[PDB]
């Protein structure tokens, strides 16, 4: 699978968490992933073919 | 269009640090003294004279 790792739009910002969010991840508790929206293009043909 | 606030997450951007230390150490003193002393006494008393 593919790694998810970079929030800004140049792939250069780690996405961060904070004391209590670590904490809660040490207690047991999971990060669930949601899709909200997916972006994509079909194919047409031109004058050209 | 309208936009609702469902949850407000604050991250406190506090610095927390810890230190601990160990120290044995030793000394070793040499003494050389030395002293002199000069002493005066007068008696004068009556037994028998």
Known sequence: PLALNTMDQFNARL???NYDQ???????KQIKLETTQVSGNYGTKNSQG | VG???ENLIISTN???SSDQG???SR???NSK???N?????????????
């Not at chain 2, 002393?37 to 004279?49: D, H, P």
């Open chain 1, 15 to 17: 996405i961060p968490i």
């Open chain 1, 22 to 28: 670590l904490k809660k991840l040490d207690s047991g």
């Open chain 2, 3 to 5: 936009v609702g606030m």
């Open chain 2, 14 to 16: 506090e610095h927390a």
């Open chain 2, 22 to 24: 160990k120290t044995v």
């Open chain 2, 27 to 29: 000394a070793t003193t």
């Open chain 2, 33 to 35: 003294t030395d002293a």
């Open chain 2, 37 to 49: 002393t000069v002493g005066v006494s007068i008696s004068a008393g009556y037994q028998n004279g």
